[PDB]
């Protein structure tokens, strides 16, 4: 796998090169990319190719302050755009995102919320919203969960963590908690139940947004304005 070509095909911003280029030397990455291309030739795959790595464009690795792990992208046209949980700005927030935003509002009663679910503002501020599976077949939830994205994304996150001590991780649900296992002595690891509508545990009481900011302050890092 050649970086220049990989970067050009996915419109990846070059600041992420040191964290992603090494993944191209792993033989399994080639297998993953071949399967992804195969899928694209036989299925309507989402999000559009140009958005699969949008997360590399909103901020650089050194700007990342918080990492929020997702599972699979939304599988309906017009929803997913490369960031975990986020939807394009004309889409009413789907249930799990609605649940996340309710907790944000509970944490920050004075937050001026927009009503939309596009998290571009958080991403530009260094909130890395990364799904462990980056693509999906339209109309079939979690359909690409076994093609190999999770190992690739895991590699990137592991490299980011080693390069960047003091990150805050928000691991919501069993899947996120099993896939990502940061050293709790080097990073702030926050766990909660899934904001998924299937969870019978209210996500509205999640105080991670506030806990994260207190942690960043003890490390002399500016806090995140969670309004969106
Ligand atoms: O980018 C996304 C979109 C959705 N979901 C999740 C939350 C929940 O498990 C289900 C949506 O109800 O998929 C993610 O993890 N990442």
């Amino acid at each position: 796998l050649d970086w220049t070509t990989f970067r050009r095909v996915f419109l990846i911003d070059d600041a992420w090169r040191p964290l992603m280029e090494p993944e191209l030397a792993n033989p399994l990455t080639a297998h993953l990319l071949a399967e992804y291309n195969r899928r694209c030739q036989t299925e309507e795959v989402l999000p559009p190719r140009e958005d699969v790595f949008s997360w590399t464009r909103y901020c650089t690795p050194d700007e990342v302050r918080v990492v929020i792990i997702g599972q699979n992208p939304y599988h309906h046209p017009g929803q997913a755009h490369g960031l975990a949980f986020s939807v394009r700005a004309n889409v009413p927030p789907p249930p799990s995102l609605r649940n996340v935003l309710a907790a944000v509002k509970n944490c920050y009663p004075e937050a001026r919320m927009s009503g939309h679910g596009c998290l571009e503002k958080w991403a530009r501020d260094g909130v890395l919203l990364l799904n462990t599976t980056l693509t999906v077949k339209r109309g079939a939830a979690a359909s690409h969960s076994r093609i190999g994205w999770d190992r690739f994304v895991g590699g990137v996150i592991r490299r980011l963590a080693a390069r960047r001590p003091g990150l805050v991780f928000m691991l919501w649900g069993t899947h996120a908690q099993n896939a990502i296992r940061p050293d709790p002595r080097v990073h702030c690891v926050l766990k909660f139940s899934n904001p998924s509508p299937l969870s019978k545990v209210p996500f509205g009481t999640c105080q991670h947004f506030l806990v994260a900011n207190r942690y960043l302050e003890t490390r002399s890092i500016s806090p995140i304005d969670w309004s969106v």
Side-chain angles (χ1 to χ4, degrees), residues 2-7 9-109 111 113-123 125-180 182-184 186-218 220-228:
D2 167 72
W3 174 259
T4 295
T5 306
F6 178 67
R7 191 215 75 66
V9 172
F10 291 108
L11 301 181
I12 282 162
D13 183 80
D14 210 50
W16 282 79
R17 182 179 188 160
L19 284 74
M20 303 179 64
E21 177 173 37
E23 285 305 314
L24 305 186
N26 189 320
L28 295 179
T29 300
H31 293 196
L32 161 65
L33 290 178
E35 179 57 17
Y36 165 69
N37 283 305
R38 189 186 72 75
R39 296 290 192 136
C40 287
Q41 295 322 303
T42 53
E43 322 178 330
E44 183 176 338
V45 178
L46 301 176
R49 185 168 65 182
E50 67 205 288
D51 291 344
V52 177
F53 293 92
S54 68
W55 54 270
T56 69
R57 306 196 285 262
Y58 296 103
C59 67
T60 64
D62 293 344
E63 285 184 284
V64 180
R65 289 181 273 169
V66 179
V67 175
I68 299 185
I69 300 293
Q71 210 172 331
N72 297 278
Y74 297 117
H75 60 272
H76 301 290
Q79 291 185 322
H81 73 276
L83 303 182
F85 296 100
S86 184
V87 293
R88 300 186 69 66
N90 63 318
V91 180
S96 71
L97 179 59
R98 171 198 74 204
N99 288 345
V100 172
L101 300 181
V104 167
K105 187 55 182 190
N106 286 340
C107 283
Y108 301 100
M113 305 301 279
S114 69
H116 70 63
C118 183
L119 306 180
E120 288 185 328
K121 175 185 177 288
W122 285 10
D125 276 344
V127 177
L128 181 60
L129 296 152
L130 194 48
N131 282 319
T132 55
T133 295
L134 297 186
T135 61
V136 66
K137 172 181 194 189
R138 167 172 175 186
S143 48
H144 284 185
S145 74
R146 294 183 188 70
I147 75 164
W149 281 120
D150 70 322
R151 183 202 61 63
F152 177 96
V153 170
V156 174
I157 290 172
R158 280 165 190 56
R159 294 183 184 273
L160 178 68
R163 162 205 197 84
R164 310 290 306 187
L167 292 171
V168 169
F169 284 87
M170 295 182 179
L171 310 178
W172 303 331
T174 307
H175 171 76
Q177 291 165 27
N178 288 342
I180 314 298
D183 187 323
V186 166
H187 305 289
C188 174
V189 183
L190 304 182
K191 295 177 187 190
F192 205 76
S193 44
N194 203 314
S196 167
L198 284 65
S199 167
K200 279 175 275 199
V201 179
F203 190 82
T205 68
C206 185
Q207 297 190 56
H208 288 188
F209 307 105
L210 287 158
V211 171
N213 282 342
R214 288 176 204 133
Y215 175 83
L216 290 172
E217 293 176 343
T218 63
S220 316
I221 295 172
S222 293
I224 301 299
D225 158 26
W226 295 102
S227 62
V228 74

